[PDB]
Curated annotation (Swiss-Prot):
Belongs to the alpha-carbonic anhydrase family. The lineage of its organism: Eukaryota, Metazoa, Chordata, Craniata, Vertebrata. It catalyses: hydrogencarbonate + H(+) = CO2 + H2O; urea = cyanamide + H2O. This is Carbonic anhydrase 1. Residues 1-27, 237-257 are annotated as: Disordered. It comes from the Eukaryota. Its cofactor is Zn(2+). It comes from Homo sapiens. PANTHER family: CARBONIC ANHYDRASE (PTHR18952), CARBONIC ANHYDRASE 1 (PTHR18952:SF282). GO terms for cellular component: cytoplasm; cytosol; extracellular exosome. Residues 1-257 form the Alpha-carbonic anhydrase domain. Substrate binds at residues 196-197. PROSITE patterns: ALPHA_CA_1 (PS00162), ALPHA_CA_2 (PS51144).
Length: 257
C-alpha cells in the first residue's frame, strides 16, 4: 500500500503521494533559537468526556483508539484556534530502538515515541472526512515521549493491546479521557503542517508540548510486539512507524512560552 519498510517507507512515499515533498510536511525539527514567541496564543484547553471513548484498532502499521465524534463532548479549544476542534482518536509512533522513535525532534534531539491526539474542525466542516483535507481541518497535539520510568497512565492502553494483536483486530476501549496522557505543563509550539503518514494531507495545525512524558523501555517493547500481519500469517512485529523530520520550507514555529 505504503508502509515503513525499505521499499515502501518514508523516502519512497513521494512516488505515490507526491505531496510528501510539499512545503508544509511533518514532522519537523524545532530549533529553539528560531521559534517566534507569540502574544496572541491563548492557552490550550482540553475537555474530553471519557464516555466518548469507543474502540482500539490495530491497523497494521500502528494502532489507534477511536472516540465517538458525533458532538462536542470532547473538544480542543484555545492556543491558536478560534473555533473548537473535536477529539476523534489518539495514537503513538515509535522506532526500532529507544534512541529514536519520536517524530518531531527538538533541536535535533530524538525521543523514544510520540503521542498524537487528533481533532477535526467541527465549527467549519461536518465530517472528519470533509475536514481531513482542509488547511484548517485538523488539530493534533504531539507529546514527546522520553524513555525512563514506566508511565502508569499508559496502563489501560497497554493492557488493551493484548486483544488487538493482529492487523484488523479491534475492540471496545471505553471510559477513557486521554487528556490524562498530556504533560502537566501546557506550553507548546504550533506550526502549520501535515499528517505524518499517508494521505499526508497538509491539514494539521500542530501543537507540540514543550514538556515530555515518560515511557518505560518495556512499555515501548509492548508497542513493538504488535503485529503488522493478519492472524495466521507469519508474525511480523511492528518494529517502527516514525517519519523522519521534514524541511520547514520557510514556515515558522511559534512558541507559546
Ligand atoms: Zn501520528
Amino acid at each position: 500500500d505504503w508502509g515503513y519498510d525499505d521499499k515502501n517507507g518514508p523516502e519512497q512515499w513521494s512516488k505515490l503521494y507526491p505531496i510528501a515533498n510539499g512545503n508544509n510536511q511533518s514532522p519537523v525539527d524545532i530549533k529553539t533559537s528560531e521559534t517566534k514567541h507569540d502574544t496572541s496564543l491563548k492557552p490550550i484547553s482540553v475537555s474530553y468526556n471519557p464516555a466518548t471513548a469507543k474502540e482500539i484498532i490495530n491497523v497494521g502499521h500502528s494502532f489507534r483508539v477511536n472516540f465517538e465524534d458525533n458532538d462536542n463532548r470532547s473538544v480542543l479549544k484555545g492556543g491558536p484556534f478560534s473555533d473548537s476542534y473535536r477529539l476523534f482518536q489518539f495514537h503513538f509512533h515509535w522506532g526500532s530502538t529507544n534512541e529514536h522513535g519520536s517524530e518531531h525532534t527538538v533541536d535535533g534531539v530524538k525521543y523514544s515515541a510520540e503521542l498524537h491526539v487528533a481533532h477535526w474542525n467541527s465549527a467549519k466542516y461536518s465530517s472528519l472526512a470533509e475536514a481531513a483535507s482542509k488547511a484548517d481541518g485538523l488539530a493534533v497535539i504531539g507529546v514527546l515521549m522520553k524513555v525512563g520510568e514506566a508511565n502508569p497512565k499508559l496502563q489501560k492502553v497497554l493492557d488493551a493491546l493484548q486483544a488487538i494483536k493482529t492487523k484488523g483486530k479491534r475492540a471496545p476501549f471505553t471510559n477513557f479521557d486521554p487528556s490524562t496522557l498530556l504533560p502537566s505543563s501546557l506550553d507548546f509550539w504550533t506550526y502549520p503542517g501535515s499528517l505524518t503518514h499517508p494521505p499526508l494531507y497538509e491539514s494539521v495545525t500542530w501543537i507540540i508540548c514543550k514538556e515530555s512524558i515518560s515511557v518505560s523501555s518495556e512499555q515501548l517493547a509492548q508497542f513493538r510486539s504488535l503485529l503488522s500481519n493478519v492472524e495466521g500469517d507469519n508474525a511480523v512485529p511492528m518494529q517502527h512507524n516514525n517519519r523522519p523530520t521534514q524541511p520547514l520550507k520557510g514556515r515558522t514555529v511559534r512558541a507559546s512560552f
